[PDB]
Amino acid sequence: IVGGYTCGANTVPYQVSLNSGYHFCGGSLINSQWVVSAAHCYKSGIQVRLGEDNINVVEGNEQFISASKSIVHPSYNSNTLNNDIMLIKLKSAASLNSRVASISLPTSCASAGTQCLISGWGNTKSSGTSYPDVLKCLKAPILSDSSCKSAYPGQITSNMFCAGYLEGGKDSCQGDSGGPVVCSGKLQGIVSWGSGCAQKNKPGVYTKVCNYVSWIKQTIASN
Ligand SMILES: N=C(N)c1ccc(/N=N\Nc2ccc(C(=N)N)cc2)cc1
């Protein structure tokens, strides 16, 4: 997260870190045994780390649970990032508590202007690189689809939405991928892609979770 702030320990209790020996993506706990992340976060050997604040220090609220199954969206296209969503089932149910909590799926879609919380352990610099140890947060509005498609001509699909600030300075970034965009208590977005980070007129692009609620629910129910 570039231009964000320190969330505060466990203030984003659905935020998970995907760990393959190191944090490589965020995700969101959607129930005790399921995380949603970006399909582009797919890899083998995922350990889901819940209750994390400082990802480099065991602070006492963590649960580390191995993925038992990853399910990349059937239509995920890695070239375009269309359908950049993946479900990860945990080998065992997370113990739910104030610091490890699921985030509600939308029952529809959010609108341009809705303020969302985007969070992650991604890069905090727009030029160069600095990785935070503690979870960073960003309040950002959903941008109109038109501004989104204007910022990224030919690349924005109906499964993507932009959020953030056309002026630059405030954005998600590498390392935030797969993590949540939560608007009005619902996971509306997954950190998906962008051009650089926090650059003028290059807002974050997020997987439009509301398009996937049927698939998420059906997939979870069947798995
Ligand atoms: N500007 C954003 N909102 C945003 C920008 C980039 C982003 N990147 N995610 N992942 C990502 C993963 C790997 C590389 C790499 N091969 N070096 C670069 C980026 C995730 C979000």
Ligand SMILES: [Ca+2]
């Ligand atoms: Ca920790």
